[PDB]
Symmetry: none
């Protein structure tokens, strides 16, 4: 249940590498998403390396501030003594899951899709149904980052950038009931975040926070 999802900005980040053929020859995009505000940072790289990753996070930090922890996968660029020491110097905790849709890399997985679609739209919009000219990649990538952060993601009233600097973080949370394994509804929990997919619930007696499927929680009354 300790899913990598922060309750507020700068608590938990998810970083990843995604290939975008449209941006070749340097088609590697390093992507990071603040699991709480959902804002994202992307940089272009010609190769998946520890050096690239370090350069990438330094950029994200410059943009979003210093996070408390970053979740990634077992990739060598993340587990290298070099990066491990880099994180340590920045005082940023690190956790590695596994390359996939495993609880700990899903949010950044979706961020890749979003980023990729935005790119395809700006690419075809400029007539580049194929590879984007090398000299127009930077700007186009920035245009994408801009759109994704400085413009609500539809269902949301507020934009990511809005959620990042001026977040809403409840101090207590209304009481709820969660459907325990037995399929029975249990009292004693309060919800702090209730998304379409997942809800964050804290235990009233242990102050433990866990994320559960939104349909396993209902108002307590």
């Amino acid at each position: 249940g300790v899913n990598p999802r922060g309750l507020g900005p700068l608590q938990i980040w998810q970083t990843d590498f995604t290939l975008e053929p449209r941006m070749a020859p340097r088609s590697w995009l390093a992507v990071t998403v603040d699991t709480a505000s959902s804002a994202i940072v992307v940089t272009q790289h010609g190769r998946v390396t520890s050096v690239a990753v370090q350069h990438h996070w330094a950029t994200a930090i410059a943009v979003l501030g210093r996070p408390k922890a970053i979740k990634t996968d077992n990739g060598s660029c993340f587990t290298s003594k070099s990066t491990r020491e880099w994180l340590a110097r920045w005082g940023i905790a690190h956790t590695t899951g596994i390359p996939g849709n495993s609880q700990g890399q899903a949010m950044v997985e979706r961020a890749n899709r979003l980023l990729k679609d935005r790119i395809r739209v700006l690419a075809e919009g400029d007539g580049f149904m194929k590879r984007i000219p090398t000299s127009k990649q930077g700007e186009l990538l920035a245009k994408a980052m801009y759109a994704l952060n400085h413009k609500e993601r539809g269902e949301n009233t507020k934009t990511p950038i809005q959620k990042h600097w001026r977040p809403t973080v409840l101090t207590e949370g209304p009481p709820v009931k969660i459907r325990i394994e037995t399929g029975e509804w249990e009292k004693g929990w309060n919800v702090l975040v209730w998304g379409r997919g997942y809800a964050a619930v804290k235990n009233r007696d242990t102050d433990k926070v866990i994320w559960v499927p939104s349909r396993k929680v209902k108002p307590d009354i």
Copy 2:
């Protein structure tokens, strides 16, 4: 002229420590004092365009930008570029205090940071190319996320005015009398119910979503 994203000052500045791409494009928001920098091989039109695209992805779209009268700012591409971005562009004589003094000071602050970081990492001369990108980002992080000295607010604080909201927007709830009473704020929505907190009694109750509405 308080107000972020109102007026920006942009210029180039030479920094040998960043060679080959030793030409740094510099922009500073005249209200928040936030600074964005990108390195380039040569001062051109596409360069400023790349820089502004970047600076925008970082700080947002500006209303107007000021520069000197160098070719890269007064060319055809650049003017059309800004027009497409819908950004007002003014020029002036290089150094003109009117609208170049602040970015000029920005130049020096940037360079000082670069020196300190570079030397601090054992680079007394040209900083290795592979490490330039990160150092540049580290500089921006310091210049924008840390206080200068006099000012008690950091550029990021002036630019984004961060704060932590502890409740949703003000709402009104239909009571048993059919009336819509104000004084409540939405905490969380779910399962067709809205959890509202009274901003007077701090009382928190669950109320059917249908009996909830905004309150200006």
